[PDB]
Amino acid sequence: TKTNIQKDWEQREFIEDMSINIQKIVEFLNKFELSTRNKLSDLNEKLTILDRQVDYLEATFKT
Amino acid sequence: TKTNIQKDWEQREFIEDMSINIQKIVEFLNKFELSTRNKLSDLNEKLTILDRQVDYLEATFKT
Amino acid sequence: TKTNIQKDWEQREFIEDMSINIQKIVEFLNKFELSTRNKLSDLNEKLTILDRQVDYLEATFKT
Ligand SMILES: [Ca+2]
Ligand SMILES: [Ca+2]
Ligand SMILES: [Ca+2]
Ligand SMILES: [Ca+2]
Ligand SMILES: [Ca+2]
Ligand SMILES: [Ca+2]
């Protein structure tokens, strides 16, 4: 119960919307890779600072 | 060596399968973003607990 | 100002390129999930080693 013109418009919109969704996925991955990398960086940095604090406490106690 | 009917069916299946694959990617990203966020949460929480333990040990030793 | 032959070629290339981009996204997700999992592993392992070091220092001090 759609005309050929309506059906063709809908089929093209479906394909156009996939092109948009693929771009939205790529943009999300760019943001999420950066976010994740920064968070991992920050955790590593905090662990490195705490490791130094523990090694100094060891040295102060053992001496 | 395919009829027009077979070729048209295959071309449509190809496009339909892309729509399904994009949805599978979106569902995976939803799960993976949540997983990653929770794991990062848990590591931060464990580091915060260990930091408190180290600061208390410092205070007990220095005093 | 394109012939029908040119327009049909371009429309098919557009759809073919989406199939390629979806595969590139899947390949990236495979690599990024593995990378992220390994990095999280490594942070957990480093925290577990530092936790053991802190517990031993506690035991040595308290005794
Ligand atoms: Ca549109
Ligand atoms: Ca349109
Ligand atoms: Ca189908
Ligand atoms: Ca079909
Ligand atoms: Ca091509
Ligand atoms: Ca082609």
Residue at C52: amino acid letter: R
Radius of gyration of chain B (CA): 27
Q: Kindly list the distances between the CA atom of residue B7 and the CA atoms of A14, B51, B60, C20, in Å, as whole numbers in the listed order.
A: 20, 65, 79, 20
Query: Which residues of chain C make contact with B48, given a CB cutoff of 8 A?
Result: none
Nearest CA in chain A to B45: A43
Q: Is B46's CB within 8 Å of C50's CB?
A: no
Measure the CA angle with vertex A40, ends A39 and A46; round to 5°.
Answer: 90
Cα gap B57→B49, rounded to integer Å: 13
Neighboring chain B residues of A21 at a CB cutoff of 8 Å? 22, 26
Question: Could you tell me the domains of chain C?
Answer: 1-61 (1.20.5.110)
Tell how far the Cα of C6 is from the centroid of ligand 6, in angstroms: 11
Structure-token match 């990203």, residue found: B29
Other CB atoms within a 10 A radius of the CB of residue A19 amount to 14
Distance (angstroms) between ligand 1 centre and the Cα of A16 equals: 5
CA distance C6 to B46: 61
Measured CA to CA, the distance from residue C24 to residue B22 in angstroms comes to: 12
Residue type, B48: T
Task: Please name the amino acid found at residue C4.
Answer: N
Number of residues that make up chain C: 63
Residue A60 CB coordination number (10 Å): 11
**A54/B51 touch (CB, cutoff 8 Å), yes or no:** no
C22 contacts A22 by C-beta, under 8 angstroms: yes
Q: For C61, which of B15, B29, B57 is closest by C-beta distance?
A: B57
Q: Give the up-direction half-sphere exposure of residue C49: CA atoms within 13 A in the CB hemisphere.
A: 10
Instruction: Give the three-state DSSP class for A63.
Output: coil
d(CA C57, CA A54): 9
Nearest residue to C21 via CA among A36, A14, B25: B25
Distance CA C47, CA A61 (A): 22
CA A6 to each of CA A2, A10, A11, C22, C41: distance values in angstroms, whole numbers, following the listed order: 6, 6, 9, 28, 53
- Only one residue has tokens 């939205």, namely A24
* Structural biology method used: X-ray
